[PDB]
Amino acid sequence: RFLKVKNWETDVVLTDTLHLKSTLETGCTEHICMGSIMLPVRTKDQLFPLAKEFLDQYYSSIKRFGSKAHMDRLEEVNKEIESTSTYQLKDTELIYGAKHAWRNASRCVGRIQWSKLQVFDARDCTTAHGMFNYICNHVKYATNKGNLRSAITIFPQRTDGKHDFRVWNSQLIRYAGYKQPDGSTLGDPANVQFTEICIQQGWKAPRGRFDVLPLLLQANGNDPELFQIPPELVLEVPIRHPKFDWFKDLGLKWYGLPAVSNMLLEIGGLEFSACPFSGWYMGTEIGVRDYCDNSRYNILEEVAKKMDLDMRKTSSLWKDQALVEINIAVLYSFQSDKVTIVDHHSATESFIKHMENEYRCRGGCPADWVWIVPPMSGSITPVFHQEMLNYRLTPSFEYQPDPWNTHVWKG
Amino acid sequence: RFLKVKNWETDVVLTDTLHLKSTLETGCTEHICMGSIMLPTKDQLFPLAKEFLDQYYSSIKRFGSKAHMDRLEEVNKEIESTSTYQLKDTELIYGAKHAWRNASRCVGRIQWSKLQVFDARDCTTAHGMFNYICNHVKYATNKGNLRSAITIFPQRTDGKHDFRVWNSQLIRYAGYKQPDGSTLGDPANVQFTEICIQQGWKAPRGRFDVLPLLLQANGNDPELFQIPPELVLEVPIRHPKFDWFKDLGLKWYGLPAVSNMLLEIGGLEFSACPFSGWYMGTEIGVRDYCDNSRYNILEEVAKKMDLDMRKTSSLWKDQALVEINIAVLYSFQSDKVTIVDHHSATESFIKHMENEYRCRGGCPADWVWIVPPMSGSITPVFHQEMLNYRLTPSFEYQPDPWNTHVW
Ligand code: HEM
Ligand code: HEM
Ligand SMILES: N=C(Nc1cccc(COC[C@@H](CN)OCc2cccc(/N=C(/N)c3cccs3)c2)c1)c1cccs1
Ligand SMILES: N=C(Nc1cccc(COC[C@@H](CN)OCc2cccc(/N=C(/N)c3cccs3)c2)c1)c1cccs1
Ligand SMILES: C[C@H](O)[C@H](O)[C@H]1CNc2nc(N)[nH]c(=O)c2N1
Ligand SMILES: C[C@H](O)[C@H](O)[C@H]1CNc2nc(N)[nH]c(=O)c2N1
Ligand SMILES: [Zn+2]
């Protein structure tokens, strides 16, 4: 079966066959589309087919499909599964797997970069202190004094589900949030629950608006332990505007390194529950979502006040005006400090070129429109006009439940 | 089978049961989501008739009464006999309102119950269609205090006697390719514009020429009619702070009126069913004015603003976009022509969804269409999970008539 997608601005038509290799479910059926829903121990039985499918993919990519090395590797993995109930990936397979999970991430607009990913193998790690050391090294490498480099650090895989490695942080670097008795929030409201956990575990909270949270790290199914990232490794950018000199006095800043730490990486049926990964920001992530969401820093009013916009009616588009200025400020600030960032015009144009390249060489590129289209100025980016097909390929990044909801406390 | 949708801004969670009534298919499967794809007998008709009459009699709280049973028998008799049937006025009105209510791509459905239905099923010629259309235009425009309306022409019979409005909307602007290579006016309408010329329209070859109506009665060849200019309310576009804006020479029409869709009620097909409401400001300012393949004025406006167009990261496109949209709203508001901004329309839609979840068990909604084409995440609909499914009565797409028609 062939499926076509059209770009309605250019009339370019592309043909998808890669969807035929999809196994996992979408959430949709013939009677209902769930495309806007945010979230829609293995036995030997299910494991060897998953391992085989993955090794067949790996061996094809290196132009060795059906070779003696391919056949010997399948036999070796098969015996390892039936003897030990699991198996270990070779370094080369781990690298390929992590890169492909990114390549397959249908919600990711930055995938033109997928083949440039520094993979740190942390599968020899045994303790939380060991995890802290690996994570510091990743942060220092990825940061590279502002010239950001994409990276992933991969801790040991799941075994019986009772010895999981987990980073409890949603991101390696994030600001604390504090609910006040009067119901207001100091800092980032998205992180209130996690901040509370940290405090309970012994963190002394400075209680400011931009306090970098400590790492809360779980090795081998043990209780997690707190560590403070050395401040000298946390690169931050004060936010100012190129024309409006009062903008600096809003007291805003953000961190340069976006580093997701709560997802699960699936490669060949193996589950890596701690696999923090980092790249760099698209400007709207900070300026639209982090700053202007009502449930986040929520600065629109204060900015519109200072611009002296007409706030008596929504039809003045005061919110839209303030939004663009804040986003100009974020890009200006990062650029001025030589910290890598990409604007939403450049990022989406590159994604369209990536997607076309993937249709030609790979036969497809799964993409989630709801996520790929930026949260401002949607239709003046080329992705708004691009039809996309969403389907799930492995290797993959997946959601997993928050560890405080599942952890068995040892005491 | 019972499904939950969450608003991630407010934590409000709604439970959908209405999807279980859905009958038609979505395009998606368990392996592939096609949510962003723009277009995915006698024996056939009685179940469709019965399904509809069942919801109608339930709506007036007379489900399983003598009048309900008698109606089902009567229609059953009429299909057996004639191979089709006729809707009562009350059913036609209910069906049209529900076709809007069920339109999953429409952010304006809080209004669904206030629809004026003009029954044009007695119409027999293109001149008659022109008359009904003029009356609809005048009624809906209401000197700028716009009122929602639909005009329903005779239903399909054997399919060789179709009523069609060839126009995509009742009021739209001409598009012309030039030797120059550029496009004068609206590039979306170049092909239709040339069909009109081919049929004998005398185009003035300007930027904003209202197209003639091309009307097909009873499967006959379509005919041209100019809408009286006095019935076409237009708005010159100016900006409340920038004096040079008016120099761009921009205007738009007040009445959005879709004329190329098919209304399905109770298995019957109404292939000419022009409907109108009023504009959300972004339709004109973001899409009509700034789409690359439309009037595409972003460059010219940015220049008059003297923005740094060297680098995309200055957000010059974005700045220009906001100002164009401020101007569209200001112009309509100043001239007292109904318009709604994207903030107001999306807030109303969230209130409508809550009403429908409470009173009906759900509200089919297509997030890709409902979220406005600018400032998405600062509108509440961005944060609202939506389930999309197909209920009937419905509006559907149909092939353009020039590809079908036998001359
Ligand atoms: C290199 C620069 C990168 C940029 C500018 C980029 C940009 C983005 C953006 C804007 C999103 C949507 C985020 C949101 O709204 O919260 C996203 C999602 C995602 N990205 Fe990329 N990305 C990049 C690199 C990567 C890398 C290196 C990985 C993995 C190795 C990756 C995996 C993903 C995944 C798994 C998601 C979806 C998360 C979810 O479903 O919640 N990204 N990225
Ligand atoms: C009263 C004011 C109304 C407003 C402000 C409104 C707003 C909208 C908007 C903004 C769209 C998206 C259009 C686009 O992007 O091209 C839409 C789609 C739609 N609307 Fe409404 N609408 C209103 C009344 C109505 C009425 C009266 C009907 C039918 C009787 C209706 C049926 C639809 C349908 C069928 C679509 C989708 C068309 C498609 O899928 O191509 N609308 N509406
Ligand atoms: N509860 C909410 N959100 C939510 C709940 C569960 C899951 C999710 C999934 O999105 C999580 C998001 C934001 N927290 O993850 C951040 C993210 C993921 C991927 C890429 C991101 N940005 C990047 N640029 C990169 C990071 C690493 C490499 S590139 C940023 C979101 C809310 C929504 C609205 C208000 S609160
Ligand atoms: N070829 C393209 N698009 C396309 C092709 C086929 C079908 C479609 C579907 O969209 C049809 C759109 C306009 N194109 O219909 C207009 C419409 C429909 C419904 C509501 C609209 N606005 C209103 N406010 C109302 C009208 C009537 C009552 S309210 C406007 C779109 C293009 C994309 C970019 C430039 S052209
Ligand atoms: C490819 C994509 O589905 C297409 O560009 C859609 C996106 N969302 C839209 N939303 C609305 N309201 N109107 C449109 O024409 C479109 N176009
Ligand atoms: C309900 C809806 O799916 C949700 O708000 C989504 C919409 N699109 C998004 N797109 C991105 N990139 N990130 C997000 O968090 C979201 N949120
Ligand atoms: Zn779907």
Swiss-Prot record, chain A:
(6R)-L-erythro-5,6,7,8-tetrahydrobiopterin binds at S36, V370, W371, F384. It comes from the Eukaryota. It is found in: Cell membrane, Sarcolemma; Cell projection, Dendritic spine. Isoform N-NOS-1 is expressed in brain and colorectum. Found in the Auerbach's plexus of the enteric nervous system. Isoform PNNOS is expressed in the penis, urethra, prostate, and skeletal muscle, and coexists with the cerebellar nnos in the pelvic plexus, bladder and liver, and is detectable in the cerebellum. Transmembrane segments: none annotated. Heme b binds at C108, Y399. Signal peptide: none annotated. Ubiquitinated; mediated by STUB1/CHIP in the presence of Hsp70 and Hsp40 (in vitro). L-arginine binds at Q171, W280, Y281, E285. Homodimer. Interacts with DLG4 (via N-terminal tandem pair of PDZ domains); the interaction possibly being prevented by the association between NOS1 and CAPON. Forms a ternary complex with CAPON and RASD1. Forms a ternary complex with CAPON and SYN1. Interacts with ZDHHC23. Interacts with NOSIP; which may impair its synaptic location. Interacts with HTR4. Interacts with SLC6A4. Interacts with VAC14. Produces nitric oxide (NO) which is a messenger molecule with diverse functions throughout the body. In the brain and peripheral nervous system, NO displays many properties of a neurotransmitter. Inhibitory transmitter for non-adrenergic and non-cholinergic nerves in the colorectum. Probably has nitrosylase activity and mediates cysteine S-nitrosylation of cytoplasmic target proteins such SRR. Inhibitory transmitter for non-adrenergic and non-cholinergic nerves in the colorectum. Belongs to the NOS family. The PDZ domain participates in protein-protein interaction, and is responsible for targeting nNos to synaptic membranes. Mediates interaction with VAC14. This is Nitric oxide synthase 1. It comes from Rattus norvegicus (Rat). The gene is Nos1. The chain holds residues 299 to 718 of 1429 of the full protein.
